[PDB]
Design a protein around this nucleic acid. Structure first.
Lengths: 84, 127, 127, 64, 81, 127, 65, 127
DNA sequence: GGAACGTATATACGCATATTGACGGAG
DNA sequence: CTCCGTCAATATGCGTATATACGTTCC
């Protein structure tokens, strides 16, 4: 996907049905059926593919610090109740 | 779809490398039992010097891994388990978890497969 | 709305005169945690003998007592309990049950109120 | 069927009503019981009385 | 009002949504924000409660820390220029 | 509408009776500055004990008090502050919060109002 | 205008397009610049170029340090 | 995209050729954090001389560069920095800015990269 | 012619969210 | 006679599908 890492376009929005929309030329487009995350802060709208895969999770995990050890799971969680 | 055992999920949260290498290799959905979530949430704060780091490592997981609510189907499956294997106060938590893998017809991923050999109809992946 | 402890429910299926009168006196919905149902479900097969009669009694209880599933909302409540009161391995199960009562804004009915007075916001009814 | 939502009361022709979003909706031909205790409404598919449960239990044998 | 009340009914359609009708002795009143939570068999509905009520709920029901933090000051650094 | 000084919000988070009792008398909207939220998030983890509380207490506050984003209008208000009272490195945080109070036409609630007497047009409530 | 959303690309006849919810939308008569780096798309209302910004800063004195 | 550290922004406002020549050669979006804008706004009045010159030059910069407002998503990232790296009074401000780069998946551009190597997932450009 | 592709109008469904009018029983 | 529970209809906001065709520019 995409010959170049960077690509730029200008233009205005257009209405599609009842929402607003931006067209993406080919060298700006994500794929087909690609789930997006959008965030708007002041002047800037950022749009990028959502990461929901285990590859993504694991990659997010591995870039964080590790706790010093791994937890010994507690067992025997259930108490005796008087009566069956 | 896979359901991760709580120990597998604790190891993922705590960054054990053997678990993280193998998890990525799995296809399709990876899910957690909500019984596992409860166990995972209690561990977060057990050791105060690591709470923050575990709070955020577990939070990252729950943003990605769907958590199965414990419903009447899982309960029916839990009853099916005890009826076949016999009641065991010790094994309730693990059987509840397994009961959800069953209810969703998911494969159950665990190191401790010998603990789940009495559960009839469970699809097991022994690590 | 009222949520019966597992122990109170065990006395109700046992037709215990002391509890059964106090239950019929209660005005309001009378709810049952699915964690309690899982405990009840195991007690049916604790002994070889009169299962099926224990099963017959439990079935009429399920036909009348609606069951709260254990879901994300209750697991949020559980996490909040561990955050205020600290983690307690022995109180995990009872805290799951109370978490549901919290989630549905229901008074928790129990023979053992002292074990729950560390759960902030829990309406208690000690018997 | 395990979800949360927020909503406001509204008027539907001389009586108050509350919408049930699709994830929280019941059936269309499902009889519900509604019980208010303070400001906490509890709704569930109709089940049958508490007395009939106590009546039914004491007319069955207890174990032990 | 009475503290307890009870009714039975089925659902209807009120637009494009399901709805349930509240009789006089179950209704919350006009323009009250609600929290709805469903967990299998049971739908519990109750008023959202977000004034303060914060101070009550649960803040004063929850343990407090040993001491109040001393706010860290001087956060903005000297930057050359 | 009311915007709380970060110290008010720290004392609210940490259960100070002098501030919890005084806040309940406040009519109208009680608001937090996003900046105040940052200071609160940082505090949650400074003592590792107490971290699980504080985390829980801050969360409950953030479920109820709207947090105000710091935007172009707030920055214009800070510019106006600094033009009228001069630059001051150690007052930048407090002046960002007041700028948002100014921008939203809210009364600033503080028990250090002498730190804020140099901000023009700022409606103050001095505890 | 400080909100997050999820969405999906769609085809709007021969060109791709992305919907912008209400709280994220810009006007209808504002000119935007859209820059993709990698697979991150960054949109904002069009202003001068960076080169013209430096050209303008260059016609004024520089601060003494 | 690129978020400029305040120091880079300061050198850009001041037309430091080694910085203006590098900024022109980036081929992605160049973004200024509203925090940096608050620092620059106060810097207009740091000294008495050349305040109007610093005012003027900051104006033509803010006329061209889009500004990231500091909002809830950024505070969310800030909290996660604190959770993984530990609290630090000294690094709060730089972390709010870096938090905005995380939120918009922007590369952070700095003379001080070593100071930001404890922020997980931050991508850096060291000048 | 005709691909490819940027631009411009449609007509629709889902679903929360409004609001309003009429029939009929029980106080 | 009026409450006020049960029928109703119907509208709008808005995200989300989908279509058709009139363009250029480059084989």
């Amino acid at each position: 996907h995409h010959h170049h890492h960077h690509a730029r376009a200008t233009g205005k929005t257009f209405r599609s049905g009842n929402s607003e929309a931006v067209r993406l030329p080919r060298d700006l487009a994500f794929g087909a059926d690609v789930e997006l995350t959008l965030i708007r802060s002041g002047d800037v709208l950022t749009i990028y593919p959502s990461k929901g895969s285990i590859a993504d999770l694991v990659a997010t995990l591995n870039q964080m610090p590790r706790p010093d050890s791994v937890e010994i799971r507690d067992e025997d969680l259930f108490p005796e109740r008087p009566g069956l | 779809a896979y359901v991760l055992d709580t120990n597998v999920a604790i190891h993922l949260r705590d960054g054990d490398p053997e678990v993280t290498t193998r998890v990525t290799a799995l296809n399709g959905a990876i899910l957690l039992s909500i019984i596992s979530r409860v166990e995972l949430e209690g561990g977060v704060y057990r050791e105060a010097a690591q709470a923050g780091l575990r709070r955020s490592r577990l939070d990252v997981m729950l943003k990605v891994l769907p958590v199965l609510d414990f419903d009447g189907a899982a309960a029916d499956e839990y009853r099916r388990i005890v009826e076949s294997a016999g009641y065991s106060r010790r094994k309730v938590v693990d059987r509840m978890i397994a009961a959800q893998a069953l209810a969703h017809r998911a494969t159950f991923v665990t190191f401790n497969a010998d603990d789940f050999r009495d559960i009839p109809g469970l699809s097991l992946l022994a690590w």
